[PDB]
Design a protein around this ligand. Structure first.
Ligand SMILES: [Mg+2]
Ligand SMILES: [Mg+2]
Ligand SMILES: [Mg+2]
Ligand SMILES: [Mg+2]
Ligand SMILES: [Mg+2]
Ligand SMILES: [Mg+2]
Ligand SMILES: [Mg+2]
Ligand SMILES: [Mg+2]
Ligand SMILES: [Mg+2]
Ligand SMILES: [Mg+2]
Ligand SMILES: [Mg+2]
Ligand SMILES: [Mg+2]
Ligand SMILES: [Mg+2]
Ligand SMILES: [Mg+2]
Ligand SMILES: [Mg+2]
Ligand SMILES: [Mg+2]
Ligand SMILES: [Mg+2]
Ligand SMILES: [Mg+2]
Ligand SMILES: [Mg+2]
Ligand SMILES: [Mg+2]
Ligand SMILES: [Mg+2]
Ligand SMILES: [Mg+2]
Ligand SMILES: [Mg+2]
Ligand SMILES: [Mg+2]
Ligand SMILES: [Mg+2]
Ligand SMILES: [Mg+2]
Ligand SMILES: [Mg+2]
Ligand SMILES: [Mg+2]
Ligand SMILES: [Mg+2]
Ligand SMILES: [Mg+2]
Ligand SMILES: [Mg+2]
Ligand SMILES: [Mg+2]
Ligand SMILES: [Mg+2]
Ligand SMILES: [Mg+2]
Ligand SMILES: [Mg+2]
Ligand SMILES: [Mg+2]
Ligand SMILES: [Mg+2]
Ligand SMILES: [Zn+2]
Lengths: 177, 116, 136, 66, 76, 52
RNA sequence: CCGACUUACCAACCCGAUGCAAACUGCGAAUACCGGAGAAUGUUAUCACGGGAGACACACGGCGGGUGCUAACGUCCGUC
RNA sequence: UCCUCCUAAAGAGUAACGGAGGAGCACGAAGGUUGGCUAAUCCUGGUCGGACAUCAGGAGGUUAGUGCAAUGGCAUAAGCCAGCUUGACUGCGAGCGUGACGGCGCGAGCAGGUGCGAAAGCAGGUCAUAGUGAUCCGGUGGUUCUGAAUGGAAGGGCCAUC
RNA sequence: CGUCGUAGUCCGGAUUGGAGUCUGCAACUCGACUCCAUGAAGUCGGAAUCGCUAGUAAUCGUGGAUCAGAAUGCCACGGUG
RNA sequence: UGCCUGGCGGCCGUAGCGCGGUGGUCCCACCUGACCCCAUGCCGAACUCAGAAGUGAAACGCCGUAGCGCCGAUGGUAGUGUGGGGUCUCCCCAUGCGAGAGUAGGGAACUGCCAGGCAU
RNA sequence: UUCUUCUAA
RNA sequence: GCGGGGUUGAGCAGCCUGGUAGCUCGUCGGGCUGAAAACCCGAAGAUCGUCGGUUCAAAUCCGGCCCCCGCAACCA
């Protein structure tokens, strides 16, 4: 809750000035962070899912919700009901502490990190990014793992416009460009 | 949203008591207050009512939206109902969980003398 | 030859053809060929009368066809007895009531439209007439 | 949160080569030694240099004089 | 050919109309769905059959926000 | 018609039995239900036996 | 690799205008049918029970239709 | 043979070697109850990831869903999850529906015993309508009802069932 | 003597980028060489097939002719054997 | 009694959307916190509990507004019961019934019971 | 064990 | 009118209760031969007749069609 403490005193004072909001409730705020691993190759065996869910449980310290197919499609050879991915929703204090560890540790540990995109805000403020490799988090031991996974991070916020979420992450020095 | 989904969650048992002809006690729960009223089987008029918005009940309480306040409402609405001669009702939970402040009201109303 | 691409059903009852029509006013173009009689126009009769008016204007102007043959018509083959199922769909008609505008036309003078629709009406079984776009 | 299903989530210390001592809550357990943090990553100085297009005329004039 | 089949007519419809006094248990409407709905003193059967739970006159009426048709037995 | 039919013999000592069907391919384990026994006038566990 | 552009080429959705439907309906009659009340009228015309049957090859005409070719002194139903 | 729609003429019914489709099952949960939930599609953003998996937002508002044909239903959901369970109870049944009949159907309530629910209540299988076979003869279990002088027994009856 | 310790490796060196040297009026097509980086295929080769009887095969370097520059070819030479 | 709000109905779009405006003493909403009651096929999001620092941003309520949705005559037209007629695949006459669509227009609901707040 | 055929002057 | 069939270049399996394309010969590339055969090695290829539907998905299931092969078209 270090950044949550950092949110409540200086980010709110910053955004109220540069947007001239009438109320303090009118400010944006982050709401949840969703950690998906679409593991489409787990239809061969459960153990790839069972270890990828084990890896994402180490990144964010929650047991992941194993997601399933909403319907059946034949291009991917899946039926409605097959376990096909895993997610973690992060809210409250656990949202901020992962968000602290993300932009301070794991984003510098990206190989050939050169910035993010400012064109990834889904028209309505909600930001989504995808990492290539789970080794950028220091939770994963390099010798103990064998397979390079990938996950994607989705920050869902209360910003109405598209730029207001872009200004919100910039108050947390989110490395756009 | 939350207000609308609560009504859909409540509107099955309300229609079931509507055809049973049951004089029915309605609890309503807010984060600050809790409400109770006994409604006639035509559904258009009430018989007795009690709340933590009334001065005579809230001043005897610490906070209006805890279980002790919720037990004080269910005790008060039952003593007003038995004064008017209403004894057998049917508890309408009104889309809340039968739990906590809702349960503490109904346990108070059973104990104070209402029959459901 | 006009024909529906898909149909919900392959065959249809014979029905009746009583009542007045609905496509009465000249909607799109300026001059119109209005049906006065009653009957059915086949897909051959519609397409033959279109050719007879397209050549009379030397493809000048624009021709609408207000009707469309969507009713399937069955026939039994020769030397087949009256039982044993409904006959095979042979051709397509459009049921025409009195008052139906059959064709429309503009981009041509009035006298050219009279002589074009007269050449077209000689290919149609029903009695027709000439109409113009009425204000209101 | 539920009681048993979650992994152990304990506050540890992560230090870096620039000496940025930072205490975070984590699932590592043992202490952590980092390499680059967001304070010392060359995103704000180093990545600007790393484009390095270079001039073709400037390469030509450097190699001699007329 | 291929079209010789049909099923027996299940004889649905409304057996007692409005303003028509019935005994308790009398079938009012037989129907597939709930094309009609059960109002006061009217039960809905297993196959959505509407029967009278009491004695009295049949009252057809349209209530509710969806304008559904309810059948009730008035007292008599 | 793979769904064969069985009988549920009362365990109350009476020879009373309910009869029913089951898919013996997909449910190899025996069916046991607690049903009313009209001879003893109690609810007694019935067990699956062969229809014979 | 990105494409560049234009072209007597087609075109979803959407929008406006316009038709069609036995197995389309956000509409919807006349009649018919069911129930109630009330006169007038009718040789109880009504129902129940019992004795005896015959008949179950129909025809044409009107209307509403299927089928056929809106062919048949054709065929198959409803109704008179 | 059975189910659904049209023909069928706005109650029911209504024929043809008329127009179109299905059924001869499935389910010990896909039943009961309590609690909760709400689709299809498209748009944008996002590691592998692509027309199409999963994730996050938005439009949309049932164009989805229903074990299966069609039709009528379905948001209080009958659609979809989970908990506990066996009412897929036995004896009855006022009163109606439907048939020439055999028969078929709907049914509040009552007695017993039960499940779920705090309780009001709900449950006598499933959204409904297909998934079926009379009688005879014979088998099995139950039942002293019968038992050809008498006591048994055989056989028969009744109940369940094949 | 030390080192690697069975791996696509400290094996293998292709390919390619950058920087050069030299020859030559002139190295773009189209030279050789060097440096830094890069690190393909290849883990002993199907049917088939070649050479060789002693300083031979096998292997290891050396030189010359041609030639401004430009050989893994050719012609010679010895080592181990 | 007025105003405002909450609850439960009546009624079921003249009652719904949209657009603009506006409300926080109370009420309501978001909200604060969560070891517990309780909860997440992960997550105090929801559900629940303990509360009251903040705000009416959202939601909700209220006010305005004809972009819609909706309502909707009158007249005519279609159909049609009975009787009659013709040129009889379809129409006409007498009489009775009389649409739908469209037009004029309406239209930003109405109302009951109880409770609370502020006024009178 | 089987094991064929080859034009032009 | 009723049955059966339509699958690499050719001839035929697999078509089976829907997730999965085979053989032979031919063809290509080598090898052997003075050379061509035969032989030896290594190869590859199918929108499963068409057109609709069912499905998550059709060579497959269903319907319609086309082509071909059968059978029957009788009684006066
Ligand atoms: Mg007609
Ligand atoms: Mg119709
Ligand atoms: Mg007979
Ligand atoms: Mg007869
Ligand atoms: Mg006859
Ligand atoms: Mg007859
Ligand atoms: Mg006729
Ligand atoms: Mg006829
Ligand atoms: Mg005749
Ligand atoms: Mg005739
Ligand atoms: Mg007749
Ligand atoms: Mg009818
Ligand atoms: Mg009728
Ligand atoms: Mg079900
Ligand atoms: Mg429920
Ligand atoms: Mg169910
Ligand atoms: Mg069903
Ligand atoms: Mg016999
Ligand atoms: Mg004896
Ligand atoms: Mg005896
Ligand atoms: Mg004897
Ligand atoms: Mg060595
Ligand atoms: Mg090397
Ligand atoms: Mg390799
Ligand atoms: Mg090796
Ligand atoms: Mg020799
Ligand atoms: Mg040289
Ligand atoms: Mg607004
Ligand atoms: Mg909360
Ligand atoms: Mg506001
Ligand atoms: Mg009028
Ligand atoms: Mg009107
Ligand atoms: Mg309005
Ligand atoms: Mg408004
Ligand atoms: Mg020869
Ligand atoms: Mg050869
Ligand atoms: Mg296939
Ligand atoms: Zn650092």
């Amino acid at each position: 809750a270090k950044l949550h403490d950092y949110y409540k005193d200086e980010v709110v004072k910053k955004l109220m000035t540069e947007f001239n909001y009438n109320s303090v409730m009118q400010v944006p705020r982050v709401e949840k962070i969703t950690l998906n691993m679409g593991v489409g190759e787990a239809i061969a065996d459960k153990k790839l899912l069972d270890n990828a869910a084990a890896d994402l449980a180490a990144i964010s310290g929650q047991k992941p919700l194993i997601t399933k197919a909403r319907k059946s499609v034949a291009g991917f050879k899946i039926r409605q009901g097959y376990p096909i991915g895993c997610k973690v929703t992060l809210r409250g204090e656990r949202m901020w502490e992962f968000f602290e560890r993300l932009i301070t540790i794991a984003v510098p540990r990206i190989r050939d990190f050169r910035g993010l995109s400012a064109k990834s805000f889904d028209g309505r403020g909600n930001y989504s990014m995808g990492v290539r490799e789970q080794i950028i988090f220091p939770e994963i031991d390099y010798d103990k793992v064998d397979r390079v996974r990938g996950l994607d991070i989705t920050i869902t916020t209360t910003a109405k416009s598209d730029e207001e979420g872009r200004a919100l992450l910039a108050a947390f020095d989110f490395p756009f460009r | 949203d939350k207000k609308s989904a609560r009504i859909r969650r409540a509107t099955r048992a309300r229609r079931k008591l509507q055809e049973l002809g049951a004089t029915r006690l309605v609890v309503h729960r807010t984060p600050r207050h809790i409400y109770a009223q006994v409604i006639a089987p035509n559904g258009s008029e009430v018989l007795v009512a009690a709340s933590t918005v009334e001065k005579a009940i809230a001043e005897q309480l610490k906070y209006t939206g805890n279980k002790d306040a919720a037990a004080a409402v269910g005790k008060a609405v039952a003593e007003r109902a038995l004064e008017k001669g209403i004894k057998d009702v049917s508890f309408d939970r009104s889309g809340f969980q039968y739990h906590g402040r809702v349960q503490a009201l109904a346990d108070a109303a059973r104990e104070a003398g209402l029959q459901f | 030859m006009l024909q529906p691409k898909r149909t919900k059903f392959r065959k249809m009852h014979k029905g009746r053809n009583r009542g007045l029509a609905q496509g009465t006013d000249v909607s799109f173009g300026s001059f119109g060929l209005k049906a006065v009689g009653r009957g059915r126009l086949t897909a051959r009769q519609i397409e033959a009368a279109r050719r007879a008016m397209t050549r009379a204007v030397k493809r000048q102007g624009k021709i609408w066809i207000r009707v469309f043959p969507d009713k399937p018509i069955t026939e039994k083959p020769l030397a087949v007895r009256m039982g044993k199922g409904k006959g095979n769909v042979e051709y397509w008609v459009a049921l025409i009531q009195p008052g139906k505008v059959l064709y429309e036309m503009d981009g041509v003078p009035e006298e050219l439209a009279r002589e074009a629709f007269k050449l077209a009406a000689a290919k149609l079984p029903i009695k027709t007439t000439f109409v113009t776009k009425t204000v209101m | 949160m539920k009681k048993d299903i979650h992994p152990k989530y304990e506050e540890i210390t992560a230090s870096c080569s620039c000496g940025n001592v930072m205490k975070i809550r984590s699932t590592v357990g043992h202490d952590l030694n980092l390499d680059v943090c967001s304070k010392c990553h060359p995103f704000f100085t180093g990545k600007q240099r790393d484009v390095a297009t270079g001039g073709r005329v400037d390469r030509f004039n450097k190699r001699f004089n007329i | 050919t291929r079209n010789g089949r049909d099923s027996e007519a299940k004889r649905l419809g409304v057996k007692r109309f409005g303003g028509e006094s019935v005994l308790a248990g009398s079938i009012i409407v037989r129907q597939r769905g709930t094309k009609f709905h059960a109002g006061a003193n009217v039960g809905c059967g297993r196959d959505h059959t509407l029967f009278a739970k009491a004695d009295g006159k049949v009252k057809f009426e349209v209530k509710g926000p969806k304008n559904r048709k309810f059948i009730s037995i008035e007292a008599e | 018609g793979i769904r064969e039919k069985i009988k549920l013999v009362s365990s109350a000592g009476t020879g009373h039995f309910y009869t029913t069907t089951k898919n013996k391919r997909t449910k190899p384990e025996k069916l046991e239900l607690k049903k009313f026994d009209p001879v003893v006038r109690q609810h007694v566990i019935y067990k699956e036996a062969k229809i014979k």
